[PDB]
Design a protein around this ligand. Structure first.
Ligand code: F6C
Ligand code: F6C
Ligand code: CLA
Ligand code: CLA
Ligand code: CLA
Ligand code: CLA
Ligand code: CLA
Ligand code: CLA
Ligand code: CLA
Ligand SMILES: CC1=C(/C=C/C(C)=C/C=C/C(C)=C\C=C\C=C(C)\C=C\C=C(C)\C=C\C2=C(C)CCCC2(C)C)C(C)(C)CCC1
Ligand code: SF4
Lengths: 739, 80, 65, 137, 42, 46, 139, 65, 31, 29
């Protein structure tokens, strides 16, 4: 036996190469480690979280340091709309002179990458101006990462290891994370915006050397304590304000103008300052809801176990049995992880959907490639987070759920009508797929036969009505905010719609992405998105709810979350575990996010080209997507290098192929299965044993990858190829035609 | 090694023992079924995990269950 | 088994003969074979003609002759 | 009211498409019908809106017709399956269609909405939850 | 000139030395360290 | 002869007959009334 | 020592490997009424002798397959024994363990790994958290 | 239960859980699962018979006559 | 005007502290 | 069973949907 892995004697005694592979695959599955107790589990998780925070801080510090060292931040400040931000320098000693010339650009005298993460715009908005400030921020983040690493080490020492009760105390953690982690952090960010960001945007330098004696507002803090809060909203930035200058600049620190700054085409800094102030107040209030040490406050266990509604006998909240759930969540780390992953996925989706339509950073809405990259990035991350939420829901079902302590509650009811849930999800998926695909191919056939007028073109009237209700007067509707006489627009009792003028100006501006005009193609692609969402949810939910067992495998819970199969008996049981359901659902998540990002990218490409009619007329049939989106926009990408030379897109050209390679490799791991490779490996073992001069000999017997390992490796190759190919295409097709 | 467990629903049909390619199972005297015998797994060290025994088992649900565990040289079926 | 092989081979030969008959009949009835024979280098061979019900008659390419 | 859709007979793009269309069976009368009855977008192609109280029959007739036909097929199949349950060999009744039984099922399913309502009211439409095979939780 | 890798940033020799070190000098010793780690008898 | 009748009631044969009949009905509808669209069914020709 | 004459076999590539000399090996012995052709477990055909035959094999499954699907089923030979041989020379007869074939019930055999319940009564894994016991091993 | 009785299966892990079977025979010895039940539908292994105890069955229709 | 040689060297020296602390944390977690 | 709580919640949600549709159909403003 080997020392490695330290956490599993079963793997340590494995005499094959599998021992290594599984050692990497189960290293962070702490609950299955040998002799693991709950307290040790929680303490190790605490230290690991400290390490992950340190890693995040080091990553941010590295981004800042490389921008300050090899970027062009100060040059980009003077002309954000025409200067390409620089990510970092290129040192690839096997470049040729054509590649060196092609990658020497953006005002640099050496090969550089063009930043597409938007960090230049973000740092510009928050008031950073010089490379020295970025360097100081990088040093500070290095020190912060060091502090968190030391904290992780310290909270593993015998005196500082928290007890299990400390980890299980939910109410104080909620109070501190609502009032302090969310509220106080938001208040401090609003303070940074008011004291630093806004003065810097008004041409006034505020730093550590002078922020103590430079008040952010002429009225001072006296106006706050005397109740004269309106003084903070007086004299806002004029519509002729020039960013990073005092020309047309007001003195207000907390306005509620709404809409966009006319020049930067982004949200007002004072608007975001007031936003974070209000958010901080709300979260600090929310952080006092639960009882910790002073009697006052709700008890979550009492709320979940309550059975009386002001005297009347109810079975629970909304007359639904919620009893016993407090112990279910409080004892299941996977349940909490499922909620956390689902919340983070929804938050990432909202981030993507709200930053492109309401850009928060100066001029970032005019950096088309950056916009596309950020949207695609956060949408794909959201999809992965949703997949993880449901995977850990299934893990909870198998490992942490017991029917006895959840007898008769709402979770048990869901487990009892899982069949109806899954069948109705399947019906929704079938209806959406059948009708969406049928209408798409009907339009395909009609357009192919020279009968484009015979297409079924269903108008998205409900979403158009919502847009009109939000103030979009293009459609001719006269409802709510698009009707100036409506009670919604006037707000008759109080007329406090100080947001409405700017909001309407932003909505009806034709040069932004705020409520883009939508037609039949948008209708069809949203229904395709709904189909993808419902099928991915069906796969994940069917896996989670059947994780404990089914008719084919009644005793699945006794086999764990991830096992290959139950053999060829009973008809065959390939891909029967809930892990296999998550594996299958990753494919559908990738497909759905591909549809979503294809739609976003093609619509915005049509808008940026000035050829919105192309999308409007071609998105209603799938040949339009295949020809006018993929084939039409692949030309510059695939001409990054050719027999006539190379340009700056060459890297993307290579990566575009690289992804297609990785994707292809995935098929090998996904189509061919283990026994073939095991027999081939046996033949190779014979060959090696019978060949002279080959003094090497395996210390771990070479074996084919396991079934589950093969599925995981194939999925990893598939996803990596997917991401690399689409990212290369996105960057090349947007940057190759624009800045 | 893998774990092979026999439950009290066994009817002593001896099919799992006949189907085993490494002689993990045998038939032992019993009184819980009409056949007066039950399957046993004294030699789970030789179990490769093929699950032919489960395929052969006629009861519902299975009277014999194989749980794949720590992999050894003979459990992976390695001739090298 | 061998008798089954022999009979099935006869059946497949019948299928192939039906296919060849179809090719010859379509080249005799629904083609431009005579026009192509007149002008081999300036006429595209064509032996399939579609009906006109759902706009698929657009597939009736101008094949010359 | 909706202003981004106009009648196809008043859309210049639709008129251009109509004029440039081939003169065959597939275009003349269909284009006249679209001009008289359809609403067109700025692209000149007919669009189907669901924001009009008027022409509500244009929405209800196709939906109702399809729902009737689909319910007819479903009720025929369901009644045939329920009639074959009492037979000795229902699987053989499923690979071999019983013509009298299928004809009777189709004739009854001609009036499928009333039969479905009667079955739902009498509790005969659905089987009880405890009488349906399910998997362990 | 654009016939060679250069750097106008401070200490442009740092990539010159660090790219070889991280990518084709140290990685094989690191793999050797990991291989010794994962093959040690108990 | 009754064996041939029983064969004609086979599920594949009946499915083929039904599909052919429905396809013929739809094809004749296309031939007689080409270009029917939602919002146009059961309306007189202008 | 194990006695018997090896079957006629000109050599093959599916024979023993380093595992035979390093870890373990198996030997199947039997008696046939006549010299006849059989199939080696790892490919090729061999000729079992008139008398008592001894064959070395890399895995126990090879011997089980040869004894069951060929010796008993095809050649009506029922006296084959499978021994496990270690590099130090230790030899133990492993099949049949007690002289009676496992499929036939024999007195004195104890119940091994028997669970006194139906498979559906295994406890949920949540009950056995951090105890190290599997649901099928629970009492 | 007895021979000819119609029963509903109560064994959760059974393929025929909450399904209906027909009793074929009952063993009068002291074995754990004496009742033999036959089903119209085969399970995933193609088997249509199984042994159950009395407490795992619910009598739903007495034997004829 | 990007950072100078001295700033890069100071950042390199400073990064040693998180490196050593990360090594300490990793070795402590391995226990 | 008439399902009182279920049908009351369902009717409230349906009334909300009908009100939104009435606004959407220009029946009310
Ligand atoms: C160790 C030792 C050893 C040895 C000696 O000693 C050997 C040898 C042999 C002979 C006999 C033969 C011939 C050769 C050739 O041509 O091919 C190869 C190539 C190469 C290049 C290989 C390589 C070689 C060596 C390894 C060298 C090393 C050196 C380095 C540089 C080190 C480095 C270190 C650092 C740290 C990184 C072979 C082979 C085969 N392999 Mg084989 N090996 C081994 C290893 C290994 C591993 C790990 C794996 C996994 C990946 C495999 C794989 C494989 C396959 C698939 C196959 C095939 O097919 C082949 C055959 O069979 O035929 C027939 N195998 N190989
Ligand atoms: C879902 C999805 C979908 C939809 C929904 O919506 C549809 C619809 C449509 C409409 C609108 C029209 C007409 C209507 C009528 O007919 O009317 C009369 C009748 C009545 C009124 C009534 C009738 C009734 C019946 C007879 C009953 C029965 C039925 C059955 C059951 C069905 C089943 C059977 C089977 C099929 C055999 C049409 C048509 C077209 N299509 Mg189209 N689709 C689709 C699909 C598809 C696909 C896949 C493809 C490819 C193949 C295509 C193709 C095509 C072509 C070529 C053409 C043409 O010519 C046409 C026209 O012109 O346009 C305008 N698409 N579309
Ligand atoms: C005001 C006091 C306070 C503050 C600021 C924090 C802050 C934090 N705690 Mg924490 N904690 C507190 C009190 C506090 N705690 C108390 C009183 C207890 C005991 C009941 C705990 C018990 C505790 C545990 C057990 C854990 C934390 C963890 C964390 C970190 C989570 C990771 C992160 O950065 O999230 C991101 C922060 C944001 C502000 C982003 C929020 C943005 C969202 C998506 C929008 C909504 C974070 C630094 C975790 C950790 O180990 O980190 C090192 C962890 O596992 N806390
Ligand atoms: C196609 C989807 C997509 C796109 C367009 C982006 C876009 C972006 N990501 Mg991103 N990301 C995605 C999916 C995506 N992400 C997913 C699914 C993950 C989870 C693994 C991440 C994890 C991630 C991290 C950790 C970071 C980014 C960062 C960034 C930004 C800079 C990188 C860039 O120019 O784009 C990316 C361009 C691509 C072509 C993506 C493919 C890149 C390689 C080739 C993929 C294969 C990985 C590797 C080679 C295989 C294993 C080794 C940019 C906004 C960076 C950031 O925040 O900037 C400060 C950053 O540090 N992303
Ligand atoms: C904060 C988020 C979070 C956390 C704490 C966890 C934590 C956990 N997950 Mg989980 N998961 C998450 C998000 C998260 N996950 C998401 C978003 C998904 C959807 C993709 C999943 C999908 C998932 C599955 C399907 C499974 C887990 C499992 C586990 C547990 C064991 C981890 C393991 O296998 O060892 C560590 C594992 C690895 C290090 C995997 C290797 C890396 C993979 C192959 C990605 C490929 C790397 C890629 C090329 C580059 C990435 C960057 C590089 C630096 C690695 C552990 C409790 C497993 C479990 O509980 O077993 C029963 C399990 O089966 N999770
Ligand atoms: C192009 C690729 C593709 C397509 C079309 C589908 C289609 C489908 N998948 Mg799927 N899948 C795919 C790739 C694909 N998958 C891959 C690569 C994976 C990863 C392994 C999965 C994993 C996966 C899972 C895990 C699940 C699905 C599900 C589904 C179904 C849900 C959608 C639906 O009902 O729409 C309606 C159906 C369709 C659009 C299918 C096409 C219907 C055709 C066009 C009708 C034509 C009829 C015509 C007469 C045929 C001509 C005759 C011919 C027989 C000779 C559907 C059948 C889910 C499911 O079954 O839920 C119901 C489900 O659970 N799939
Ligand atoms: C491989 C064999 C084969 C194939 C694929 C076809 C295919 C076709 N034949 Mg054809 N045909 C065949 C053999 C074949 N034939 C033979 C052997 C004969 C002689 C009896 C005919 C005599 C025949 C006639 C008389 C007609 C077709 C027609 C057609 C077309 C429509 C068929 C239909 O509606 O049903 C179609 C392209 C029709 C057509 O092309 O209409 C223009 C048509 O009128 N066929
Ligand atoms: C016999 C008629 C019949 C009826 C009444 C139903 C009814 C139902 N099916 Mg269903 N189904 C049928 C046949 C039928 N099915 C067949 C033959 C198949 C195999 C292709 C399926 C496959 C199927 C799936 C995969 C799903 C359903 C679902 C459903 C439910 C909602 C969706 C729906 O209405 O149909 C949906 C119908 C389809 C998806 C395709 C059916 C179309 C076939 C070709 C109709 C065949 C008619 C038959 C040949 C008539 C012969 C009768 C004659 C002898 C008199 C509903 C209870 C869904 C569900 O569980 O929702 C809760 C679901 O996920 N069905
Ligand atoms: C996570 C942060 C991060 C990342 C991804 C990068 C990325 C890069 N750096 Mg870099 N760097 C960083 C932080 C970072 N830097 C910091 C904080 C410093 C100051 C000490 C430097 C100083 C630096 C120099 C001097 C040079 C680079 C260079 C490079 C490039 C080649 C790699 C190399 O030689 O590394 C060199 C790395 C170092 C000298 C020290 C890196 C210190 C960081 C903090 C380590 C981070 C470890 C990470 C968080 C743990 C990973 C965990 C794992 C599971 C993934 C590459 C673009 C080279 C370049 O520009 O080529 C063109 C180059 O010559 N870097
Ligand atoms: C107004 C309108 C609309 C809407 C609508 C809606 C929204 C609806 C809803 C609906 C719903 C919400 C429904 C529900 C349902 C439920 C249930 C529960 C059902 C059931 C059913 C059944 C049971 C059936 C049966 C049968 C029959 C009767 C026949 C055939 C066979 C069968 C058996 C299948 C739209 C826009 C679209 C269009 C226009 C008009
Ligand atoms: S899994 Fe295979 S080797 Fe193990 S006892 Fe069952 S039949 Fe024998």
């Amino acid at each position: 036996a080997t020392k490695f892995p330290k956490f599993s004697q079963d793997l340590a005694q494995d005499p094959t190469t599998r021992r290594i592979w599984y050692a990497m695959a189960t290293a962070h599955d702490f609950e299955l480690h040998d002799g693991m107790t709950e307290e040790n589990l929680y303490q190790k998780i605490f230290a690991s979280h400290f390490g992950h925070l340190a890693i995040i801080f080091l990553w941010a510090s590295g981004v800042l340091f490389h921008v300050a060292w090899q970027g062009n931040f100060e040059q980009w400040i003077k002309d954000p709309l025409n200067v390409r931000p620089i990510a970092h320098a290129i040192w690839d000693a096997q470049f040729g002179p054509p590649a060196i010339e092609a990658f020497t650009r953006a005002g640099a005298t050496n090969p550089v990458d063009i930043c597409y993460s938007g960090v230049y715009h973000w740092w510009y908005t928050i008031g950073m101006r010089t490379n020295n400030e970025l360097y100081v921020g990088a040093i500070f983040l290095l020190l912060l990462a060091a502090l968190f690493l030391f904290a992780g080490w310290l909270h593993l020492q015998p005196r500082y290891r928290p007890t299990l009760g400390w980890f299980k105390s939910a109410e104080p953690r909620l109070n501190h994370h609502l009032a302090g982690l969310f509220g106080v952090s938001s208040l401090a960010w609003a303070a940074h915006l008011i004291h630093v960001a806004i003065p810097e945007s008004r041409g006034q330098h505020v730093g550590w050397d002078n922020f103590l004696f430079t008040p952010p507002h002429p009225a001072g803090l006296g106006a706050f304590f005397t109740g004269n809060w309106s003084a903070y909203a007086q004299n806002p930035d004029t519509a002729q304000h020039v960013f990073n200058s005092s020309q047309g600049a007001g003195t207000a620190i907390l306005t509620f103008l709404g809409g966009f700054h006319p020049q930067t085409q982004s949200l007002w800094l004072t608007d975001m300052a007031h936003h974070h102030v209000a958010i901080a107040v709300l979260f600090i209030i929310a952080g006092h809801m639960y009882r910790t040490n002073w009697g006052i406050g709700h008890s979550i266990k009492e709320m979940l176990n309550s059975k009386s509604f002001f005297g009347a006998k109810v079975e629970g909240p909304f007359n639904l049995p919620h009893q016993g759930l407090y112990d279910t969540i409080n004892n299941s780390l996977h349940f909490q992880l499922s909620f956390a992953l689902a919340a983070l996925g929804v938050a990432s989706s909202l981030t993507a959907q709200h930053m492109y339509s309401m850009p928060p950073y100066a001029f970032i809405g005019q950096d088309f490639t950056t916009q596309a990259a950020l949207y695609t990035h956060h949408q794909y991350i959201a999809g992965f987070l949703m997949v993880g939420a449901f995977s850990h829901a299934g893990i909870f079902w198998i490992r942490d759920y017991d029917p006895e302590q959840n007898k008769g509650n709402v979770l048990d009811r869901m487990l009892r009508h899982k069949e109806a849930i899954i069948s109705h999800l399947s019906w929704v998926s079938l209806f959406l797929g059948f009708h969406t695909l049928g209408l798409y191919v009907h339009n395909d056939v009609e357009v192919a036969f020279g009968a484009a007028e015979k297409q079924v073109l269903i108008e998205p009237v409900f979403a158009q009505f919502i847009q009109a209700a939000h103030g979009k007067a293009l459609y001719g509707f006269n409802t709510l905010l698009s009707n100036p006489d409506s009670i919604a627009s006037t707000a008759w009792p109080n007329h406090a719609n100080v947001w409405l003028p700017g909001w309407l100006d932003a909505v009806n501006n034709t040069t932004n992405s705020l409520f883009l005009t939508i037609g039949p193609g948008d209708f069809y692609v949203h229904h395709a998105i709904a189909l993808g969402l419902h099928v991915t949810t069906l796969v994940l939910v069917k896996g989670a709810l059947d994780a404990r067992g089914s008719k084919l495998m009644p005793d699945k819970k006794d086999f764990g979350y991830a096992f290959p199969c139950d053999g060829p008996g009973r008809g065959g049981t390939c891909d029967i575990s809930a892990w296999d359901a998550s594996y299958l659902a990753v494919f559908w998540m990738l497909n759905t996010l591909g549809w979503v990002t294809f739609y976003w990218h093609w619509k915005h490409l049509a808008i940026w080209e000035g050829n919105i009619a192309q999308f409007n007329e071609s998105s209603t049939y799938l040949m339009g997507w295949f020809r006018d989106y993929l084939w039409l926009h692949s030309a510059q990408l695939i001409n990054g290098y050719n027999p006539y030379g190379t340009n700056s897109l060459a890297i993307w050209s290579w990566m575009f192929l690289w992804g297609h390679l990785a994707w292809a490799v995935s098929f090998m791991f996904l189509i061919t299965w283990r026994g073939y490779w095991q027999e081939l490996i046996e033949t190779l073992v014979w060959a090696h044993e019978k060949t002279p001069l080959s003094f090497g000999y395996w210390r771990d017997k070479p074996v084919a990858l396991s079934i589950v390992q093969a599925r995981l490796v194939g999925l990893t190759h598939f996803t990596v190829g997917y991401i690399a190919t689409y990212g290369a295409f996105l960057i090349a097709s947007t940057a190759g035609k624009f800045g | 090694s893998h774990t092979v467990k026999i439950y009290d629903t066994c009817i002593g049909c001896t099919q799992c023992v006949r189907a085993c390619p490494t002689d993990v199972l045998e038939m032992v005297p019993w009184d819980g079924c009409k056949a007066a015998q039950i399957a046993s797994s004294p030699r789970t060290e030789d179990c490769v995990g093929c699950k032919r025994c489960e395929t052969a088992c006629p009861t519902d649900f299975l009277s014999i269950r194989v749980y794949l565990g720590a992999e050894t040289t003979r459990s992976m079926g390695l001739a090298y | 088994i061998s008798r089954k092989i022999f009979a099935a081979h006869f059946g497949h030969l019948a299928v192939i003969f039906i296919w060849l008959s179809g090719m010859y009949f379509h080249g005799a009835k629904f083609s431009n074979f005579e026009a192509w024979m007149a002008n081999p280098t300036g006429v595209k061979p064509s032996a399939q003609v579609v009906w006109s019900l759902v706009g698929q008659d657009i597939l009736n390419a101008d094949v010359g002759g | 009211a909706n202003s981004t859709l106009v009648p196809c007979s008043k859309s210049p793009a639709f008129q251009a498409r109509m004029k440039n269309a081939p003169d065959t069976y597939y275009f003349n009368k269909p284009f006249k019908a679209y001009a008289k009855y359809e609403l067109c977008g700025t692209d000149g192609l007919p669009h189907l809106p669901l924001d009009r109280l008027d022409r509500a029959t244009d929405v209800l007739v196709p939906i109702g017709l399809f729902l009737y036909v689909a319910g007819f097929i479903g009720w025929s199949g369901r009644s045939y399956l329920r009639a074959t349950k009492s037979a000795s060999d229902p699987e053989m009744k499923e690979i071999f269609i019983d013509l009298p039984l299928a004809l009777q099922s189709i004739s009854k399913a001609v009036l499928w909405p009333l039969l479905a309502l009667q079955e739902f009211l009498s509790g005969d439409l659905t089987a009880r939850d405890e009488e349906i095979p399910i998997s362990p939780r | 000139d654009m016939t060679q890798l250069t750097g106008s940033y401070a200490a442009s020799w740092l990539p010159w030395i660090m790219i070889p070190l991280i990518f084709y000098i140290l990685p094989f010793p690191v793999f050797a360290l990991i291989f010794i780690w994962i093959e040690k008898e108990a | 002869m009754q064996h041939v009748f029983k064969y004609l009631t086979l599920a594949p044969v009946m499915a083929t007959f039904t599909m052919v009949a429905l396809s013929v009905v739809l094809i004749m509808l296309q031939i007689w009334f080409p270009g029917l669209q939602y919002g146009t069914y059961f309306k007189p020709t202008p | 020592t194990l006695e018997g004459q090896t079957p006629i076999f000109g050599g093959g590539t599916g024979g023993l490997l380093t595992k035979a000399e390093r870890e373990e090996k198996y030997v199947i012995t039997w008696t046939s009424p006549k010299e006849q052709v059989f199939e080696m477990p790892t490919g090729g055909s061999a000729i079992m002798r008139q008398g008592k035959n001894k064959l070395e094999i890399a895995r126990k499954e090879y011997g089980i397959a040869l004894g069951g699907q060929q010796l008993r089923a095809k050649f009506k030979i029922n006296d084959y024994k499978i021994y496990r041989v270690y590099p130090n020379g230790e030899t133990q007869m492993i099949h049949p363990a007690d002289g009676v074939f496992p499929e036939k019930v024999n007195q004195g055999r104890p119940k091994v790994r028997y669970v006194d319940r139906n498979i559906g009564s295994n406890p949920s894994p949540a009950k056995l958290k951090f105890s190290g016991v599997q649901p099928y091993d629970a009492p | 239960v007895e021979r000819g009785s119609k029963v509903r299966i109560l064994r959760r892990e059974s393929y025929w859980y909450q399904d209906v079977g027909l009793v074929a025979s009952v063993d009068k010895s002291g074995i754990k699962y004496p009742v033999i039940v036959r089903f119209d539908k085969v399970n995933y292994a193609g088997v249509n018979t199984n042994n159950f105890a009395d407490f795992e069955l619910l009598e739903i229709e007495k034997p004829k006559a | 005007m990007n950072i100078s040689d001295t700033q890069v060297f100071v950042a390199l020296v400073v990064a040693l502290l998180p490196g050593l602390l990360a090594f300490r944390l990793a070795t402590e977690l391995y226990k | 069973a008439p399902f009182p709580f279920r049908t009351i919640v369902s009717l409230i949600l349906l009334a909300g949907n009908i009100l939104v549709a009435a606004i959407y159909f220009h029946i009310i403003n």
